[PDB]
């Protein structure tokens, strides 16, 4: 299906899909695209309307340029943002640990105002970071990701509250711009209004209008119908335009003699000067769109007319008089309603180009703020535009931005799915956003406007629920910064293919139809009565007359990683949240067999993932290697393709790539040539197909305990790859320099014979913990020794040296081979930070077996750990004797509500078994509709079911009715889907048939070396005497409070005196009790906690005669 | 009458409410550490004490010459505020901030707050001879047994 190298996979799609899935990176690729302003961006945002497209940099230019001095005698201008070429490829930049950047030119001009001057000078504005075709960024070699930050859109926010004293209705509105002060038009509990701008206690409406320069007559004429404000014109208590506007300036400061400045011009510096009060371009459009303004206009500005202000005055009073509709002179009529808070039309998305746009904006806000200052103090006629530009704070703002931001994070590269789902991700918190503890549990929940645009399922389980959203499949970004959704439009019961991108705002007015609808061959409905939703979102049931718009598909509320999860409709959404979150934490294996049953996502997923070799040009294969593929294009030229071999992740997983095709194949542009990670044959794979059992057995599946079979470890089918990196340098100190050498202080030679000529170890050594990695040695100084050891050195006749034996050794519980050796040096032209002479890096990889306790799960949210690795013979097995793989427990079924595994158990055994339905005379009613041509199956088959349109239940029972056996005539699995099994321990058959079958499982990343910690004696803090715990530290175990309460509840106080004293803080006891353990003598009495006495000294510091008696 | 009664009961005096000598805490509670590469770190209190000693020597030299009183109440006032910022920053007027416009740590800052007596003592801490790992079932064991 529109994929060149696709393997066949049979589906249960009852419907079609008229529109294909869009490109998934287009949320990020088309976002970049725009600050540059590509020619592809030019035509792309030129064919879909988009009359006069302007560049993102240009958007800061034409508002920034021209630059004008306070004297008005000279001027400075900017023009033409453009870009140079790249300086290094991605493999070099990731290799040589730099930024992936390209130069930037902007042609500026100084223009004198006294006589006119043409100082035009294309100035190198600095380096500029660049996005890959993978959608990524490289900072110091690190691959980092920009997170999308959801914010509320600026504009007009109407609201009505009801008080609890007199229970009546006050009507307010808060109107927010971008980067300015606020203003609120409220209604009092009494009469009348609430018109304090920037929170100065109250204003009246009329003094805003009369001091705005309008008669009290036109208050009656335009706003007298609208009779509650007649009381404002009664109790306005000041007659006179400036006579009340002086009192307005008294409301401003207070206490300053007003002039003709502070009458109108200062007010028009808050609302009619567009240099400090500048609402959003979309917020402009939102003002027009709400207020029913002159909206057929190509306009662009950020200026605030007062006519909109009196418009929202009269809309406000028509609201609080009780109405439904409203028109305006000169503009479109508006249905009167209150506003929503968390509606999507009120909450937009700052994209990365808007983010970086803000960072360039503040970068010129910090850059130019001395340039206009130096328009005076620099010498006239002696200034070139080069002498006025400091390019330094701009790139300081860029590198400042990519560092220390919680919107820039590392790529989670441990699953191509996980790397995909780190993108398309919707975040609420951040700079320019809310505070985490200081935001209530009301923005967290979902609202019916969330439908079709953001999936409500994917969120982390911890303290982030409602904070992290996930973008759906068919969404698309508004150039204004919103979500747009295509919908099928039906006229008179004729569904068109007319794909119309739509927002939720206009969707409120309109009629959204049903996906699974009885549609008859044209767009015509069998039934006349259809379920539908109102603007409230309530589910109503309507006759087939009003319907203009139809759904495009099922799965519209479903995100990407959500869409890979079959039989969702039969299990709990909470469990779906669990295992849906779990699949990003999968690990790669070394085999990558395709899953037996999936959907139409996985083949569609990895082709947009970009870890797999996609054929660029339709040609023929010339010659491949183990490491490269030299293709033959149909028109002349060739191209080689270097696949990446065993690249280290951010988490230490394997990024090896491998060829899948031959040397002479006629291939087409877009096809798969070679895959890398967990993918196979064009589609993802998180594990293997395994034979499952559903009985409880000997407490070894006791409350989600999981067991295994012996074959898998010996057939190595779950083997993992883990690369751990170590790094140390050679530096300089005050006394001298650090030394990397083969010369060691007092040491064995067995620990040296695997090291090279110059320190470091050689290729392919197998280490154990405590072995020495890099030979590092520093000078001591000049100290003295004890006379006794100095005697012994004379006895053994060997002074050592005046140096220190401080070398690099391996941390613990670690083994494996070292593959790569990377090493730098300051004298060898290497750029690396100061004080350092020489650098080295080590890459240590290791095959790891699967063992007990590791984190295992199935796709339906079921999970658990490995209790016992059995032998091969104590095992349930068939009448044909075939041993089982794992056994799952019964009671995870009822209370966790997860029967989809049972569903795919039956369907999975149907797939391994294969069928050929014997309806040679008449098709049964279960199979009477679904597809045709499906009633056979060659076993070991390749099948799929979509999300909501897959199989139905009688069909599932129907496929079991054909049972193509393994070798002989043998119905091992009955029509109820159970088998008769033998004891693998004593031998006898079991007196009940048992549910068994196949299930596709997976493996995660919580290995037993990761969370193990242990310590008897190690390092301590320097502030306190407490043990210190980190990565290379042994770790320490934090002992709490309620713990101590329970220790009191025993009353085992000698234990407590052991715990808080000799184990925590008293230094002089530790030597005593440790040495007593050494000699095996008595436990000494615990002395005074000296950490306690520290408090007493603090009290004695502050004029306190404290004393003990 | 409560507090006049309080001085009335005990064998104390209100002499300590004014001071003519200021104690100094031991130095290891304001310890100074140099990292590798010559990277120095220490406590905030030390330069505050330096403001104290510079004002005491400054006044101390300035009295001996003699002065108009405008200087005198100025220097004594700076001395009093130095004592105040030594004990508790931010109580009187603007808090003393340093680099980054962030407030410093006074004596009460070591005592009050999220480094308080709970948060120093009763917060609990980590000790050795301990560990942690993941767990599985031991169904063949006994109650007194463990693996």
């Amino acid at each position: 299906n529109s994929v060149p190298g696709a393997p066949n996979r049979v589906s249960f799609a009852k419907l079609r899909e008229p529109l294909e899935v869009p490109g998934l990176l287009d949320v990020q690729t088309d976002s970049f695209e725009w600050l540059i302003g590509s020619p592809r961006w030019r035509e792309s945002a030129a064919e879909r309307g988009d009359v006069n497209p302007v560049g993102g940099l240009e958007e800061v230019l034409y508002e920034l340029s021209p630059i004008e001095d306070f004297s008005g005698s000279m001027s400075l201008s900017f023009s033409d943002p453009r870009f140079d070429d790249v300086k290094a490829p991605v493999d070099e930049c990731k290799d040589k640990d730099m930024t992936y950047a390209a130069p930037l030119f902007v042609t500026a001009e100084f223009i004198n105002n006294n006589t006119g001057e043409i100082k035009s000078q294309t100035v190198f504005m600095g380096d500029f970071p660049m996005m890959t075709e993978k959608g990524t960024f490289i900072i110091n070699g690190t691959e980092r990701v920009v997170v999308s930050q959801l914010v509320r859109s600026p504009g007009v926010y109407f609201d009505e509250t009801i008080d609890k004293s007199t229970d009546k209705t006050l009507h307010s509105v808060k109107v927010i711009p971008s980067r300015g002060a606020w203003l609120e038009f409220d209604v009092d509990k009494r009469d009348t209004v609430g018109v304090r701008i920037d929170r100065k206690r109250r204003q009246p409406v009329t003094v805003l209008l009369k001091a705005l320069g309008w008669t009290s007559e036109q208050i009656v004429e335009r706003f007298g119908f609208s009779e509650i404000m007649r009381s404002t014109l009664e109790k306005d208590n000041t007659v006179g335009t400036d006579e009340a506007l002086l009192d307005i300036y008294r409301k401003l400061r207070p206490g300053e003699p007003p002039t003709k400045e502070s009458a109108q011009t200062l007010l028009e510096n808050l609302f009619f000067k567009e240099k400090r009060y500048d609402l959003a371009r979309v917020g402009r459009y939102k003002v027009n769109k709400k207020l029913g303004l002159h909206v057929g206009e190509p306009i662009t500005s950020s200026t605030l007319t007062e006519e909109d202000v009196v418009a929202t005055i009269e809309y406000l009073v028509r609201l609080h008089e009780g109405q439904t509709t409203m028109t305006v002179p000169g503009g479109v009529e508006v249905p009167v309603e209150t506003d929503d808070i968390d509606h999507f039309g009120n909450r937009r998305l700052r994209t990365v180009g808007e983010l970086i746009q803000n960072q360039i904006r503040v970068g010129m806000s910090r850059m130019e703020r001395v340039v206009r200052e130096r328009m005076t103090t620099q010498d006239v006629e002696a200034i070139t535009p080069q002498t006025l530009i400091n390019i330094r704070p701009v790139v300081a703002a860029i590198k400042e931005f990519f560092g220390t931001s919680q919107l820039s994070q590392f790529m989670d590269q441990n699953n191509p799915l996980s790397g995909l789902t780190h993108k398309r991700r919707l975040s609420a918190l951040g700079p320019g956003g809310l505070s985490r503890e200081r935001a209530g549990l009301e923005v967290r929940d979902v609202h019916p406007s969330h439908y079709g645009r953001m999936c409500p399922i994917e969120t982390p389980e911890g303290p982030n629920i409602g904070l992290i959203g996930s973008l759906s499949v068919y969404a698309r970004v508004n150039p204004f910064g919103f979500i747009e959704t295509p919908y099928r439009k039906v006229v008179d019961g004729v569904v068109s293919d007319e794909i119309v991108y739509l927002t939720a705002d206009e969707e409120d007015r309109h009629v959204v139809a049903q996906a699974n609808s009885p549609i008859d061959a044209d767009g015509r409905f069998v039934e006349p009565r259809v379920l539908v939703r109102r603007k409230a979102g309530e589910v109503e049931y309507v006759p087939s007359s009003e319907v203009d718009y139809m759904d495009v598909s099922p799965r519209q509320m479903v995100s990407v990683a959500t869409a890979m999860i079959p039989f969702l409709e039969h299990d709990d959404a909470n469990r779906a949240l669990m295992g849906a979150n779990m699949q990003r934490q999968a690990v790669p294996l070394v085999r990558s067999e395709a899953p037996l049953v999936g959907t139409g996502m996985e083949l569609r997923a990895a082709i947009d993932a970009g870890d797999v070799v996609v054929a660029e040009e339709s040609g023929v294969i010339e010659e491949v290697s183990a490491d490269y593929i030299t293709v033959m294009h149909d028109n002349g030229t060739r191209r080689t393709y270097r696949m990446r071999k065993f690249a280290r992740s951010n988490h230490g997983t394997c990024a090896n790539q491998c060829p899948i095709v031959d040397a002479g194949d006629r291939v087409e542009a877009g096809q798969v040539i070679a895959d890398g990670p967990c993918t196979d044959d064009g589609e993802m794979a998180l594990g293997k197909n395994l034979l499952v059992a559903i009985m409880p057995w000997e407490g070894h599946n006791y409350e989600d305990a999981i067991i295994l079979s012996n074959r898998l470890v010996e057939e190595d089918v779950l083997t993992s790859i883990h690369i751990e990196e170590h790094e140390i340098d050679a530096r300089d100190t005050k006394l001298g320099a650090e030394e990397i050498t083969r010369d060691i202080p007092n040491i064995s030679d067995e620990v040296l014979a695997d090291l090279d000529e110059r320190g470091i170890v050689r290729i392919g050594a197998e280490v154990r913990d405590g072995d020495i990695l890099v030979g590092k040695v520093t000078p001591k100084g000049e100290t003295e020794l004890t006379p006794e050891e100095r005697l012994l050195r004379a006895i053994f006749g060997e002074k050592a040296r005046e140096v220190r034996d401080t070398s690099l050794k391996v941390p613990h519980g670690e083994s494996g081979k070292v593959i790569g050796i990377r090493v730098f040096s300051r004298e060898d032209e290497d750029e690396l930070p100061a004080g350092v002479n020489e650098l080295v890096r080590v890459y240590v990889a290791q095959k790891r077996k699967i063992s007990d306790g590791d984190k295992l799960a199935g796709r339906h949210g079921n999970k658990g750990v490995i209790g016992k690795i059995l032998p091969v013979e104590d095992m349930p097995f068939l009448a044909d004797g075939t041993p089982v793989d794992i056994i799952l427990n019964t009671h995870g079924v009822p209370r966790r509500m997860n029967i989809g595994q049972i569903l795919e158990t039956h369907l999975g055994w149907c797939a391994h078994s294969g069928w050929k339905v014997d309806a040679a005379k008449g098709v049964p009613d279960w199979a009477a509709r679904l597809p045709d041509e499906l009633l056979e199956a060659q076993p070991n088959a390749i099948v799929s079911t979509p999300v909501f349109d897959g199989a139905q239940e009688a069909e599932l029972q129907g496929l079991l009715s054909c049972t193509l056996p393994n070798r002989d005539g043998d119905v091992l699995v009955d029509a109820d889907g159970k088998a008769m099994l033998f004891d693998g321990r004593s031998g006898e058959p079991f007196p009940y048939p048992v549910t068994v079958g196949y299930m596709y499982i997976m493996k995660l990343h919580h290995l037993v070396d990761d969370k193990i910690h242990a310590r008897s004696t190690g390092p301590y803090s320097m502030i306190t005497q407490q043990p210190l715990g980190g990565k290379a530290q042994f770790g320490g175990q934090r002992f709490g409070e309620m713990e101590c309460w329970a220790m009191q509840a025993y009353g085992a106080a000698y234990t407590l005196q052991e715990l808080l004293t000799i184990k925590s803080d008293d230094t002089v006891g530790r030597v005593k009790v440790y040495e007593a353990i050494v000699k095996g003598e008595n436990i000494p009495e615990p002395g005074i906690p000296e950490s306690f006495k520290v408090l007493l000294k603090e009290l004695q510091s502050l004029c306190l005669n404290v004393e003990v008696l | 009458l409560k507090v006049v009664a309080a001085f009335q009961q005990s064998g104390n005096s209100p002499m300590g409410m004014v001071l003519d000598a200021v104690p100094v805490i031991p130095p290891e509670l304001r310890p100074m550490v140099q990292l590798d590469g010559g990277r120095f770190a220490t406590s905030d209190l030390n330069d505050l004490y330096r403001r104290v000693i510079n004002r005491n020597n400054r006044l101390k030299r300035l009295i001996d010459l003699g002065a108009p009183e405008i200087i005198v109440n100025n220097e004594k006032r700076m001395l009093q505020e130095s004592v105040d910022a030594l004990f508790d920053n931010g109580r009187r007027g603007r808090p003393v901030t340093g680099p980054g416009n962030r407030p410093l740590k006074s004596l009460s800052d070591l005592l009050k707050g999220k480094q308080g007596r709970f948060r120093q003592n009763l917060l609990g801490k980590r000790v050795d001879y301990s560990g942690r790992s993941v767990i599985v079932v031991g169904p063949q064991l006994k109650l007194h047994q463990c693996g």
């Binding site: 404002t232 109790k235 208590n237 | 009187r92």
Partner: peptide, 24 residues
């Protein structure tokens, strides 16, 4: 009549703090 509430007190609050910080 477009006096709100607590505004003379807000002058006493911001003034009671204002001569305090001005006298600081």
């Amino acid at each position: 009549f477009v006096w709100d509430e607590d505004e003379s007190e807000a002058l006493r609050q911001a003034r009671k703090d204002a001569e305090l910080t001005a006298s600081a």
